[PDB]
Structures are given as structure tokens and as C-alpha cells.
């Protein structure tokens, strides 16, 4: 599977949605224009956000969405971050994609 | 050679003796039937030369001996299309068979009986008897696993074997593997032939509901299954099949539980989105989910997720779903069970609650 | 565009609008659905660029408006292998539409609603309401003898003629001609169309289940057909389509009745022994009597004799079996009344009781 | 297309013995006749004809796919018995009627 990310590790942790939404603001064009290098067509398999917390644990997770899509990539931000922060500090907030798999042509055999 | 018999004993013996014709013969004998009045009996024969299939209709009017051999469908669709209840009187007038019923009258061509093709006689090894239903469950269940056309002939066609008390037919075409077993509740002599996949079909279109057994006899190169007054005969195929023990997967050390339906609807909708040549869907298994996903060159793609019963370490393989498909829908069961191994080896897959059938896949590359 | 609509308000209209989408697609577009939510409507429009299905679904549910086009098949595959009752939830996003229900998701790929063929306005001329089910008697009763792919394009399909209160089709493609009228309890404007063979065949897949008024209205060069929430659009076909009336043999006065049921069993046994490419029957009039034989190359013969109502010159005539036969299986009554004029002459054909159909077969030479 | 024999009596038979004796006798020049046209001698039909001294006659003939005598003879006994109503038969007749050539021309309507 390819993956294509990019990710901000903040100077100080933020404790406030408006300070994650500015992030993922600023972090949406470089993630397109690094997946359109890749994949004009901005079309994708899935997309999601990864948030890592001040004690370095984090939750990421992708769903289906077939572009890229910053409102799509806000709206589970904010239900990741709401939800899963636990009132901690965030350390870091990613943006990512994984792209459509090549097709499967190659069927094994049974070695008879 | 004269009969006259009332159209509905002859129709189901028609039908029947028509089975291995199919479509367009080789020899116009092929696709003739062999008539022949012997004492107050009727034989009807189909053959294509692999196999034959015989009916005998008894003669409770007025007959006279003698064979011919005449078209078979046009000597069926003249039979089905008289009115019902019609007496159909049959008589050899030299070349020609004169067919007469009401102020229908029909004139065949016949080839001589004496040239007819016979599937010569021989010596049954294993004679045994099972329900008809048994027969059909078995070849049900590994029909869909046979070769159709693989170089190696002996892959195009079912291993029927005997161990014990129980008959087994395997087949494979390589990509994946079927076995059923079932007892027969005689104890049979240890044995295994190959069947032609042409004869487990027709022998497939023999088998009815049925009050009556399956007779099987079991010779050096043929078999026959005797089903009242239906007698069809298989030459077999002389070749060594494959032994299926070592292509199970040795050490399936992940086992995921599912419910049949559930799987196999979510594997269909995922398969409108594969690809339609290579139908490659991947499932990720983790605790107690399974992930289908497809995606095709047009890039679409779909996501099923079921919950199952799994708690091995996650896991991803690819597979052509309609091999999927095919084993769940010969499953039919309400769970199944799949056993895993890794990404690039195959996996078993049975109904959760009966050992009767098991299922070898080989999976496709990530 | 969002909607979310439960699966079975979806399956039916999405059957209907996938419709037109016959075989393999010229243009990607053509083989796709469009999609419009506009105020509390969903339309799914499937068009070949002659005719075109729309139907219309309420949206009880949330929704928003806009509009795209997704390919049909995969998008009723998914919705139909979705369980019953599942919500089936829709959104655009992009070039991509998201159908997701249950945790099940796919993306299709679509195409720009502003690339889908609007078959543009035009004003109907004539209008008329009736029963689905007297449509469908009267295109059925027909549509056997429409041409196929007759140079003479106005052959291609189907005349559909008012007048008085007397709705009638015509069909005829040089062989044989067939004509229904019924009477629709309302006054007509005197005028006719033809309607292409396909969107015949399509205006048929449409009527069913005969409870909803049909609504047809008539431009100069479309008709559209009203059922319910669906609208079927085609385009007409220009020229002058043949006057049954002249059709019609001018003085048949040999007059045959006979049961229809007899009749055509009787044709499709001789039927069995004709000429596999030409299908020559050869019929023999005499008092009271109708012989039909048929021979083929294999020189077999068949011969029925029937008692039949005949009290005129005696004759011989020829005819395609296939062609008499399509028609003794669209007139369905008791009793059917031939009336022939010669061997070289066509005949007309009609329930003895009804004058609602009439078939003209032109012969074959002896 | 028809292929016939037949005889015309000298003196009117009135016994079916002396009308098989004449089937007898036309059979083989009837099978001769046959064959030059068609030497499998497969036909549609056949059958016998009888003139009755009263100048009338009767022609009776059936499906049967061979020219054949013992089915000529079947048939002949049957007309005899059947339609001579006592007469002196004048003339005995067998024939066959040909399977029938193929169709192959559909007329149009002329649209």
C-alpha cells in the first residue's frame, strides 16, 4: 500500500480545536500538492488524520473517501479530536491519504 | 421394428437418452438414438462415444423386434409436441422410421442400428448402492472445482474414491480444490477413478428427487449408475489424479469464524467493484473483523466490513472473489470456518459445524 | 447532491431507468444514470439517445440538490445487493459518488450531468390516456411483424394510429403485416406515428402490471409515455409508414375456420420437418379439410391432417411455418378464420370471434 | 411429381386374387420407373388406383417414405374391398407421389 502524508510536530502542544483546524489548514495544500505530484487526479482510496498526543500516543485511522478533500479531512479532525484527545496536549497533527491499490492480476496455484 | 407406446412413457426416457448429445454433433449417427424392440421392451441410446445413456420402456402393446437408430431431438420434439396422452405408433419401414399418431404422420431417416456406437462391456470392481440425493450432494459439491480444459486431462473431470464406508469426489483445477465425503453405510473396497467432467455433469442431469437408488458400478475404465430404468455408462479417465492431501495448507494456525450469508453477500457487492478480468478482492483480517475491499482500473472501489470470530494476528491475503463465491454458495451452511496461514498461501474454508466438504483456495498476490 | 433513500424505493426505478442502456455502450455516458436531486426529488434518467426512461423518487429523507451521472449496472448491482431494507446513503463528492449503507461503502466514478443527452422540448400535439394492459395487447399483438434492420426505415418499428376513439398498431415487415385496434373511451384527433422497434420494446419493458393509467403524448417528431412516476421519451420515425387497409387482400373469399389450439399444434409438429432455413409448410385446402406438410433436405416428411370449417375451391398454398405460426401464437383465442385468395396471394388471419386483430403472411412459392 | 404404372384389364376382374396378381406384375415395372428418377427410391406417398366398369375410379394413397409392395398390396386390398361395391374393376394403377422439392422463394407484399 502507498501512502502519502505530511504531518506538522507544533512548537508548543495546542489544547484548542481552532489551533488544530489552523494546522490542518495550513498542512491540506502541501498534502495536495505533494499527492498531486503523485496522482493529478487527487483520487485516493482513503483519507484521514492523525493526531498525536503529549504523552506520544496517537490515533490516526483513514476511511473511505475517494479524493482529498479538506472538509472531509476537517470533519473527522474534529471528531478525532473531540472524542479522543482526553483533554490532553497535541504534539503533532497529520494529514494522509492511501492510494487505490495496483490491480491483483497474479493468482497463485495450488502446485499440483 | 414396431412399437406403440402412449407419449408420456416416452418423453422422460427421451429427455433422458438425449442428455450427453449436446449441440452439434461430429457424426450424424452422434445425434441419433438408438431404438430397439427386444421382447416387450423398448431400449432408447444417446451417446457422444464417452459416454451413453440407455432407457427401457416396457412394451405393454403389441411390438416387433428389430433396432434402428433416428434423430434424436427431431424424434423428441415430434413426441413432446403430439397432443398429451397420444399413442404414438413406431414402425421401421426400410430406411426411414414412419412415427403415426391421431392423422399426424412423421418420416425420420434412420442410420442402421449396426453402427451404432457401444460403449463395449466390461467388469464392475465395486458394485455398491447409495440415495440419489447422496450422489447429487457429493458432485455438488466439487462440480464447480473441476478443470475445464487444462493440458492435464486427468484435472478435467472428479476423483470419485472409495475409503471405508464413504465415497469422496475431489476436484481441482489448480486455482482451488473441493472434497466431499460421505458415508454410504457399506463397507466398500478401497478405490478411486477418475470421472470425466462431461459424465459428472450428465450423471448431474441424471440424478431426480428419486424414490429410487443409485446403483454404481465401478470397472478398469468405466462406471455406470443404474437409476430405475435409466442406465448411463462413463468411460473414465486414465490418469493419475493428484493427491489432494498435500495441497491442504499444513499448518492453518489462523482460524476465522463467519456467518456464510453475511460473508458471501458482502464479498458479492465487493466484487461488482473488482476487476472483471482478475476479480482480485483483499480481506484484512484483525480481532474479530474481517475487511473486504475491491477496487477495479476505473477506480472505483468498495468496502465491506463484517465482525467474525478471529483473534490470530492481523492479516491481509488477496483473492479472486468468484472463487470465494463459489465455495460459499456450495457451502449453503449458516457459518463457515477459514483457516489462514499467510499472505501467499492457500486457505481452507468449511462449513463451521460439518466436516462432509472442505475447500482449498490458492490466493492471489498482493 | 446527497440523498439518502431507502433500497427498495430505489430498485424498481433504477431496473426501469437501466432500460434503454441495451448491450455494450457507445459512449461511456451512455452506459451511465443520471442523478438530479432537485427539491424533494430524485430523477434517475437512462438514455440510448433515441428514447429515454426517467423516473422520479421522492426524498422523504435529508438531501441536496445537484446532480451527476454514475454507471447504471454497477450502481443497481450495489443497491440490489445491499440487504432489503437498508438506507442507502448517496453523496457526490467530486468525480467520485459515495453510496455507503450499513458498513458497506463504494465510490463510482461519474461523468458530468452536463454531459448527459437532454432530448430537448418540444410540445405534444395529441394526448391520451388508457390502460398499461390494452397498450401492451395492442404492441403485443403486433410487434412480432415489425421489421428489424429493413432499409426502408419506416418498417424499423411500429405504427401507432388514432381516431374516432380507436387506438391500432401496425407492424409489418414485408412478409407478413399485423394490426390491433381497440377502442379507449374517448375521442381521438385523427393522426399516426411511428415509433422506432426499440422504443417499442422499451414502452413494453415499461407496462406491466396494469393498474396505472398509461399517459401518451404525441409530438411531431417524439412521444412520451407516462406510468406512474415514470416517463419514457422517443423519438418518432419519419416516412410513410404502409397502409394496412391495402395490405389487406382485397377479396378473400375462401374462408377457413379452425381451432387455434389444433391449428398451431399442428403447424409446429410439421414445423419439426421443414426446412431448417426456409421453414416451407405447404397447405391443402379441400372440404372440410386442412393438410399441412413439410419436408426438408434430409428428405423426412411429416404430414398433419386437420378437420377443419371449409366449404370453398380447393387449394394449395405455401408459407414460412415460423411466420404462421407467430401468428396463431399472438392471436391466443378459440377459433381462428383464414381467408385466402390463391396460392401466390397473401392470406389474412383473425380470431373467428374478433375483428380487434388482423394478420396478413404473404406465401411462399410452391 | 408422380411416378405410376398401370394395366388395363381385357376382360374386368372381379376377384381380388386376380387384382394382386396384377399388383404383382406392375410392382417390379413401377420399381424400375421409380428408380431412373430416383434410385433410393424415397417418395412421399403412394399408392393404388382402381377404374370401375362404370367408369368411375378411385385413387387411394397414403404417406409412406419407399415405394414398397407388401404396403401396396395393404392398401389395394383395403380399396378393393372397401370401394368396389361389387363392380368389374378395368384397370389396376400403383403410384407414388415424390417428396416434394424444397421451398425456398418468400414473396413480399410489396410495401
Redesign the interface.
Known amino acids: 500500500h502507498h501512502h502519502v502524508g505530511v504531518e506538522r510536530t507544533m512548537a508548543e502542544d495546542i489544547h484548542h480545536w481552532s489551533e488544530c483546524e489552523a494546522i490542518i489548514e495550513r498542512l491540506y495544500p502541501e498534502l495536495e500538492r505533494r499527492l498531486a505530484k503523485v496522482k493529478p487526479?487527487?483520487?485516493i482510496?482513503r483519507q484521514g488524520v492523525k493526531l498525536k498526543f503529549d504523552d506520544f500516543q496517537q490515533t490516526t485511522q483513514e476511511?473511505?473517501?475517494?479524493?482529498l478533500?479538506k472538509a472531509?479531512l476537517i470533519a473527522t479532525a474534529r471528531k478525532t479530536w473531540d472524542e479522543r484527545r482526553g483533554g490532553r496536549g497535541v504534539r503533532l497533527v497529520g494529514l494522509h491519504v492511501t492510494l487505490?491499490?495496483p490491480?491483483?492480476?497474479?493468482?497463485?496455484?495450488?502446485?499440483? | 421394428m414396431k412399437f406403440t407406446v402412449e407419449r408420456e412413457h416416452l418423453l422422460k426416457p427421451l429427455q433422458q437418452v438425449s442428455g450427453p448429445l449436446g449441440g452439434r454433433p461430429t457424426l450424424p449417427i452422434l445425434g441419433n438414438l438408438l431404438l430397439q424392440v427386444a421382447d416387450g421392451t423398448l431400449s432408447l441410446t444417446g451417446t457422444d462415444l464417452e459416454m451413453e445413456m440407455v432407457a427401457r420402456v416396457a412394451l405393454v402393446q403389441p411390438h416387433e423386434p428389430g433396432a434402428t437408430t433416428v434423430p434424436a431431438r427431431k424424434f423428441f420434439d415430434i413426441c413432446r409436441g403430439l397432443p398429451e396422452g397420444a399413442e404414438i405408433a413406431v414402425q421401421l419401414e426400410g430406411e426411414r422410421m414412419l412415427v403415426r399418431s391421431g392423422r399426424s404422420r412423421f418420416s425420420l431417416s434412420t442410420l442402421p442400428a449396426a453402427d451404432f456406437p457401444n460403449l463395449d462391456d466390461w467388469q464392475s470392481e465395486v458394485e455398491f448402492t447409495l440415495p440419489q440425493a447422496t450422489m447429487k450432494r457429493l458432485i455438488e459439491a466439487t462440480q464447480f472445482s473441476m478443470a475445464h480444459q487444462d493440458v492435464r486431462y486427468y484435472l478435467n473431470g472428479m476423483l470419485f474414491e472409495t475409503e471405508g464406508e464413504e465415497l469422496r469426489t475431489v476436484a481441482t483445477d489448480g486455482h482451488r480444490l473441493a472434497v466431499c465425503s460421505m458415508p454410504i453405510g457399506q463397507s466398500l473396497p478401497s478405490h478411486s477413478v477418475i470421472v470425466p467432467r462431461k459424465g459428472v455433469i450428465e450423471l448431474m442431469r441424471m440424478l431426480d428427487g428419486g424414490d429410487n437408488p443409485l446403483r454404481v458400478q465401478i470397472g478398469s475404465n468405466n462406471i455406470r449408475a443404474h437409476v430405475g430404468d435409466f442406465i448411463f455408462t462413463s468411460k473414465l479417465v486414465d490418469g493419475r489424479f493428484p493427491d489432494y492431501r498435500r495441497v491442504l495448507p499444513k499448518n492453518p494456525d489462523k482460524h476465522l469464524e463467519a456467518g456464510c450469508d453475511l460473508l458471501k453477500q458482502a464479498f458479492a457487492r465487493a466484487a461488482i467493484l473488482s476487476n472483471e478480468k482478475f476479480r482480485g478482492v483483499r480481506l484484512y483480517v484483525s480481532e474479530n473483523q474481517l475487511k473486504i475491499t475491491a477496487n477495479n482500473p476505473e477506480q472505483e472501489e468498495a468496502e465491506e466490513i463484517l465482525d467474525v470470530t478471529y483473534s490470530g494476528a492481523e492479516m491481509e491475503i488477496g483473492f479472486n472473489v468468484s472463487y470465494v463465491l463459489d465455495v460459499l454458495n456450495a457451502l449453503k451452511c449458516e457459518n463457515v470456518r477459514m483457516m489462514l496461514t499467510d499472505s501467499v498461501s492457500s486457505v481452507q474454508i468449511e462449513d463451521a459445524a460439518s466436516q462432509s466438504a472442505a475447500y482449498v483456495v490458492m490466493p492471489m498476490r498482493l
Do not use: C, F, T
Open positions: 487526479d487527487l483520487l482510496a476511511h473511505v473517501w475517494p479524493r478533500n472531509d487505490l491499490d490491480q491483483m492480476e497474479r493468482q497463485l496455484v495450488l502446485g499440483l
